Symmetry: C2
Subunit: 145 residues, 2 copies
C-alpha cells in the first residue's frame, strides 16, 4: 500500500508549498496503477501523464490520459485539481468532451484534498456526476490513489 | 510485464518524425510505472515522480522523472528522456544540476529513446558521465523498465 496516504500528505501541508508534490504524486499513482492493466491487455489504451492532445500552442494537456495508439486519440482523461476548484475544472473537461475534437469519451476530475471525484460521459447533456468509475476502462479509479 | 509496443517499434514507426510527444511521455509512464511498486513495497525509499519541480517557482528545473525523499524533501535521483537533438543539452543539464546546485541529487541519468542508450552521472565524478543504466542509489537497473 501507499507509503504515505493522500490524507496524510494533505494534513502535513500546512503552508501549502507541498501542493505540486502531492499533485504529481497523484499523477504517479494513477499512471502506475493503470499501467499493469495495459501491459496485461486488460485495457487497450496506454496511460500517459501530462500529454499534449495536439501540437497547438493552446493544446490541452490532461494530467493523465488513456491513449488509443491505433486511432491517435485520447479516450479517457483525468484532471487532478491543484490550487483550483473541483467544479470549475469539471466545467472545463465537459467542454473538451462535448466539442468532439479529440475523441474523448469520458473525463474525471479529482480533488486530492477531499479525495472527491466528478465524472463526465460524452452524451450526458453536459451534466457531471459524483463517480470515480470508468465505464470505458471498467475500473474504479479511486482504487489507485 | 512486457510492453505492448516496444520503444524500438514506436521509433521505427515514426519515420515521419512527428510522434515524439507520445513516445517521450510513454517512456516517462514506463519508468514511473516500473519503479512505483518498488516504492510501494519499501524496496526503495524514494517516490518516483514524473515532471516534478525540484524547488520553488517557474525558475525550478523539472526533470522528466525523479526519485523523491519525502523525509529530506529532495530528489535523490533524476532521469531525463531525450532524442538525439536533446542529448548534449540533457547531459550538460544533469551534471550542472548535480554539481553546480544544492538540490541533494546523488545521481542523474539521460535516456535517449531513439538509440535506447543510457548515460549516468554521479555526484563527485568530476563532470564525467558514463554509459550506465544502473542506479547505485536504488540498486536497480533502470533499463529493465523501458
Ligand atoms: Na525530456
Amino acid at each position: 500500500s501507499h507509503p504515505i496516504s493522500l490524507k496524510t500528505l494533505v494534513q502535513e501541508d500546512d503552508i501549502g508549498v507541498n501542493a505540486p508534490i502531492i499533485h504529481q504524486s497523484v499523477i504517479a499513482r494513477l499512471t502506475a496503477g493503470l499501467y499493469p492493466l495495459y501491459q496485461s491487455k486488460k485495457i487497450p489504451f496506454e496511460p500517459l501523464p501530462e500529454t499534449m492532445l495536439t501540437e497547438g500552442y493552446s493544446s490541452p494537456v490532461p494530467d493523465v490520459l488513456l491513449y488509443d495508439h491505433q486511432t491517435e486519440e485520447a479516450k479517457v482523461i483525468i484532471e487532478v485539481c491543484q490550487n483550483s476548484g473541483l467544479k470549475h475544472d469539471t466545467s472545463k473537461i465537459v467542454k473538451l468532451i462535448e466539442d468532439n475534437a479529440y475523441g474523448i469519451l469520458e473525463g474525471f476530475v479529482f480533488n486530492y484534498k477531499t479525495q472527491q471525484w466528478l465524472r463526465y460521459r460524452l452524451g450526458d447533456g453536459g451534466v457531471a456526476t459524483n463517480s470515480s468509475f470508468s465505464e470505458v476502462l471498467q475500473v474504479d479509479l479511486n482504487t489507485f490513489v
